[PDB]
């Protein structure tokens, strides 16, 4: 096709939407996964803490959330007469959101795997365990917010 | 009428006084009846010092001893002879 | 013990499906990948349906 | 000996086995031998007191 | 197409019906069950009938 | 799952149902569910027999689901008949409402014209065609999320008579009339579209039918962007209902703290409802991709 | 020109991956479940059926991958356009290794819900949410999935 | 060779015939070993046991046997002038079945050894034993379900 649009610009696009996915599932699969099996090991002894234990596993869900809109935003400015441009961008926006979210949950997986523990053997603990989530989560939210502004710069002023 | 249960029905915490001679008597009625959900009341008391003990370790004695009974049952050709009645018959205690 | 129900159902089945492919149907035969020849499988699975019929016999005569 | 008990064992242990039921909850109960022994509290259905 | 309406009627109309004239004993599960089990009938039914009713697509097939 | 405290409305009675049906939806043939309802029917005449006996481990957990796959087996007969297939294979007890070409030639792609209308379950025809799996996949994906949504709105109105049950009178306000207004005007518009979608005769009114996922979407990305309207006046509908959705969001999150100490927990409460919502109606497809398995 | 003899493979390997992957994940779920479960169930065999779950919610995952791997199979095509041959790539990748981070995640989850499990039943709703929300991400992945072979044929020329 | 019809599309066709028994042999031959390590193990204590654990060696055989059939479809659909349509598709279905009977292989052996281990002092852990490795199974089921799907859908509507 036409050198401002060649038929390869597609990959792009499509492996961005494919890296932002499975980089997010792959992190919230790591945090759900540390923190399941420190609730399961903690909480067997403790069972009445374990409704509530559950947020890193909840945060670890919200990453992946973010990884689906990012990733179905992306996935709806896709085309095969897409420019360059588009796809150079969606491959970039798509990256960044999900190995935000991979380090969001590592993050998140990390320390609430020690938080569970800390707070079945303190409860006052908690708070602290909450505002790292937090704090971790804002990650994945920067990923997020660099990703959308890099989807809404892709359609704008293009040819 | 009817007392079906879409989630529950009221119910109600209720305490009982009874006098010392029908107090078994009326415990066992109450539990082949088999109705009312008792709080705790003496959990404080342990185990070891608990009102009861001696006739329940009795109680422990005896069902060893049935245990016993039926190793000598089933080491033997014999087993729940009156297990076709007997076990209707705990089961016809409802409403009885 | 185990050969009596599924002979139960066995016998059945193939009866049904045997019923199907001697009335020459469209969702068994017809097409030019189907076996075609209708009432060869249809006898063949005739006898099928028989010998699933003599192992229910033979299973049952233990009761 | 052995055909006698078993015509009556299984009666004997699923009878031993409620009393053991009724003291344990007797137990459960707020007795008390210096006045009127035994007194207690439960959860009753409103409906069918 | 009011084909599916008209079945979806009678088929309230029968629900409505059993609400009442369910038996005055066990009235909570019989009436769950039997209003549920019709109503959820009639919406998978009425979701088969609609898919065949105005095709997009038409099947192919290479052989008889 | 959890003990039901009190006397709100539970969920131990939709269930008898719901559950079968559900299953029987991931679930339908004639076959298969013919052998397991022949189980459970052996497990229900005997019971008397079974009630005097140990099951053991083979059959613990189905005595104590003994009644449960009867009419698990009941609703697995009802999608066999929908879902045409006896052991995938279609049934011909109804004439097939699409009629193929007089004279077929051997070996070539053969079309199909719709003649007629199928009274109950798929046509026939479509047994064994190549474009059948895309006609199955396009039929479930719109069951699926229709039966999930309902579901949907059934518990959220079992929401709504606890709520009423009690005075509750903040909690309605807070919780059910915004979530409520959220999910419909984003899902249940979905669904009236898409039956909407069924109801009109695109090939023959010469309007090309939409892009469902699209139709959904752009409303997020950009209101009005519609490639053709369902019907008139849409984008208008589009963006009406879509700022209801937005605000329903602040509604969601102020008025129930209102005295907020509670903060806290409704605004967890309010972020995990929307995302458990969408997440939910995305899991209900789950029931598609077990009827393809 | 936008039709390459070898767009298909593109296309070809998306609907490959997308059951490859998503059976690898599948199967270490199932087989660290499963080693939890009969180490466990020795000591207490009643409960089999119910720790059965982490398995089947785990093959769950393979079930998302088949069924991935026939909607996209039944958008290939000979003269299909590269770009056709891209989405299809990229949906099965997103699928595939979506459900093997999900196998991954349920798999040692569902090995600590079986052990703890073993000790004291509460634990069976705490590993069941647990796992729930680990089998999400193979729901994401099938949403992805979804959405980008629905668009991989929307305006091909 | 024409456009649609190379002098290198019968690799692909041909490397997928082969990849396929490859790797299914590789799950079976693992599961095997495995299994045999527990059965062996397990049933010199109780080899009375011996019919009966030896279940996971004939599902590898299945395994094996989805493979084998696999494979020799989709050798006569090979062809010297065939399309690389074909040839792709061959591949990508020899591929899809290979590993996936190669994890269900992995899986199956873990579970085997560790069941069989199991039953030598517990025996009604035999049905769930038998039920995990279904589920197993079912894997390689699906990588034979896709593998003879895309072998039908490759020879038909070629040029």
């Known amino acids: 096709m036409t050198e401002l649009c060649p ?68 996935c709806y400015s896709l085309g095969q007469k897409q420019a360059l441009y588009t796809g150079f961008i969606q ?18 997986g990390i320390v609430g795997d020690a938080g569970v523990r800390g707070s079945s053997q303190q409860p006052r603990l908690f708070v602290g365990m909450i505002l790292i989530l937090i704090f971790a989560e804002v990650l994945g939210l920067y990923g997020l917010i660099v990703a959308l502004l890099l989807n809404s710069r892709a359609t704008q002023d293009v040819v | 009428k009817e007392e079906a249960i879409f989630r529950s029905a009221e119910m109600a915490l209720v305490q009982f006084y009874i006098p010392q001679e029908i107090s078994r008597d009326s415990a066992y009625t109450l539990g082949q009846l088999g109705l009312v ?33 039926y190793s000598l049952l089933k080491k033997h050709d014999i087993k729940l002879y009156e297990g076709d009645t007997d076990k209707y018959l705990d089961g016809s205690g409802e409403l009885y | 013990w185990c050969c009596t129900v599924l002979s139960a159902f066995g016998v059945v089945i193939l009866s049904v499906i045997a019923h199907l492919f001697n009335t020459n149907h469209e969702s068994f035969v017809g097409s030019i990948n189907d076996p075609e020849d209708g009432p060869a499988v249809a006898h063949t699975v005739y006898l099928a349906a028989l010998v699933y019929l003599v192992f229910f016999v033979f299973c049952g005569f233990q009761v | 000996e052995l055909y006698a008990i078993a015509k009556e064992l299984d009666s004997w242990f699923q009878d031993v086995t409620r009393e053991k039921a009724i003291f344990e909850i007797l137990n459960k109960s707020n007795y008390d031998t210096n006045r009127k022994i035994l007194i207690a509290e439960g959860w009753i259905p409103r409906d069918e007191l | 197409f009011y084909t599916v309406v008209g079945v979806f009627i009678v088929v309230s109309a029968m629900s409505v019906l059993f609400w009442i004239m369910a038996p005055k004993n066990n009235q909570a599960v019989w009436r769950s069950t039997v209003i549920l089990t019709l109503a959820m009938m009639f919406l998978m039914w009425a979701i088969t009938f609609l898919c065949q009713l105005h095709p997009l697509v038409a099947p192919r097939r290479s052989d008889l | ?132 799996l895309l006609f199955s996949n396009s039929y479930k994906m719109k069951l699926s999320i229709l039966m999930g949504f309902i579901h949907m709105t059934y518990s959220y109105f079992f929401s709504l008579a606890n709520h009423l049950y009690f005075n509750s009178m903040i909690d309605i306000i807070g919780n059910f009339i915004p979530g409520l207004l959220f999910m419909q005007g984003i899902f ?69 703290p209102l005295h907020g100490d509670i903060m806290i927990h409704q605004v967890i409460h309010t972020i995990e409802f929307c995302l458990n919502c969408v997440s939910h109606t995305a899991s209900y497809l789950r029931l598609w991709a077990l009827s393809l398995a």
């Open chain 1, 91 to 108: 491959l970039g926006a798509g990256l960044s959101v999900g190995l935000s979210g991979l380090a969001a949950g590592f993050a998140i």
């Open chain 1, 7 to 74: 038929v390869y610009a597609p990959f792009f696009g499509a492996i961005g939407c494919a890296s932002a996915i499975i980089f997010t599932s792959l992190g919230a699969a790591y945090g759900t996964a540390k923190s399941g099996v420190g609730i399961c090991a903690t909480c067997v002894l403790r069972p009445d803490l374990l409704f509530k234990n559950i947020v890193p596993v909840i945060m670890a869900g919200i990453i992946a959330i973010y990884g689906l809109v990012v990733s179905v935003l992306v």
């Open chain 6, 1 to 132: 799952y959890g003990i039901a405290q009190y006397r709100e409305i539970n969920a131990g009675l939709p269930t008898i149902v719901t559950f079968p049906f559900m299953f029987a939806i991931m679930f339908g043939d004639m076959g298969h569910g013919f052998l397991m309802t022949l189980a459970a029917l052996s497990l229900v005449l005997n019971e008397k027999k079974i009630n005097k006996m140990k099951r053991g481990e083979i059959f613990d957990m189905a005595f104590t689901g003994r009644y449960i796959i009867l009419l698990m087996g009941v609703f697995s007969m009802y999608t066999g008949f929908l879902y045409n297939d006896i052991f995938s294979k279609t049934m011909t007890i109804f004439k097939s409402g699409w009629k193929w070409p007089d004279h077929w030639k051997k070996g070539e792609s053969i079309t199909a014209t719709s003649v007629g209308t199928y009274p109950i379950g798929l046509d026939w025809a479509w047994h064994g065609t190549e474009n059948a």
């Open chain 6, 188 to 256: 249940g518009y979905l669904s009236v579209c898409i039956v909407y979608k069924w109801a009109v005769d695109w090939v023959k009114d010469g309007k090309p039918a939409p892009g469902l996922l699209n139709m959904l979407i752009n409303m997020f990305l950009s209101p009005g962007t519609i490639d053709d309207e369902l019907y008139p006046h849409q984008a208008k509908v589009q963006v009406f209902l879509l700022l209801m959705a937005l605000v329903c969001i602040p509604w969601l999150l102020l008025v129930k």
């Open chain 2, 37 to 69: 959900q008792f709080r705790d009341l003496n959990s404080k008391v342990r185990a070891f010092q608990r009102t009861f003990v001696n006739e329940i370790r009795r109680l422990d004695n005896v069902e060893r001893q049935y245990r016993y009974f």
